Amino acid sequence: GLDAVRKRPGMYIGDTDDGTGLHHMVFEVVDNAIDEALAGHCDEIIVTIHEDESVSVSDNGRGIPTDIHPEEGVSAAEVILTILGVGVSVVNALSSKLHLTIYRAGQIHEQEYHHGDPQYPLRVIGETDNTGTTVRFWPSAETFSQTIFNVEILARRLRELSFLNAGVRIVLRDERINLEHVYDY
Ligand SMILES: Cc1[nH]c(C(=O)Nc2nc3c(O[C@@H](C)c4ccccc4)cc(C(=O)O)cc3s2)c(Cl)c1Cl
């Protein structure tokens, strides 16, 4: 039901004009990585503001499940990204593009979406000794009247999450000003 999200984004992500809803897009992805840390699976989260104005969030948790979901006939990861915290499916719906990478059970999986529509089924692209999830997303300029992330707004929330989740190392990178901050209680 991502149609409803695109039609009334304010109801799902908050104010699309004043910067709050825009930064909520990053916070929703980070909150999924924090849940992975609370469960004891993740101890490092890297949040990057890219030169292209996109944001990536990488965790070293379990990685989103990749096995086919019986009811849906597609990867569990696709079901989580494409069917309605508000959930990462809201971030996907309101992103012109989203790139998902999963490191799980010795394999690297990827899927790309445009406005929440998968471009191809989740595919294995290589081998890895690591586990975790990376989401890179480009917020839709059709939804958000401002799409430029403020490193100070992200920094304040990441500092809070670092404090509240001691033992998670949170790295904030802003490629636009070559900034890196490490939050580790
Ligand atoms: C940056 C980032 N990281 C994650 C992330 O790691 N999420 C993971 N979710 C699971 C998991 O629950 C799935 C089936 C589920 C997700 C939402 C609601 C209900 C169910 C199950 C398992 C498992 O059984 O191994 C592992 C994971 S890891 C997300 Cl989402 C985002 Cl965004």
Author numbering: 29 to 112, 131 to 231
Article, verbatim:
We have developed compounds with a promising activity against Acinetobacter baumannii and Pseudomonas aeruginosa, which are both on the WHO priority list of antibiotic-resistant bacteria.
Important interactions are hydrogen bonds formed with Asp87 in A. baumannii (Asp73 in E. coli, Asp75 in P. aeruginosa), the conserved water molecule, Asn60 in A. baumannii (Asn46 in E. coli, Asn48 in P. aeruginosa), Gly 95 in A. baumannii (Gly81 in E. coli, Asp83 in P. aeruginosa), and Arg150 in A. baumannii (Arg136 in E. coli, Asp138 in P. aeruginosa) as well as cation−π stacking with Arg90 in A. baumannii (Arg76 in E. coli, Arg78 in P. aeruginosa).
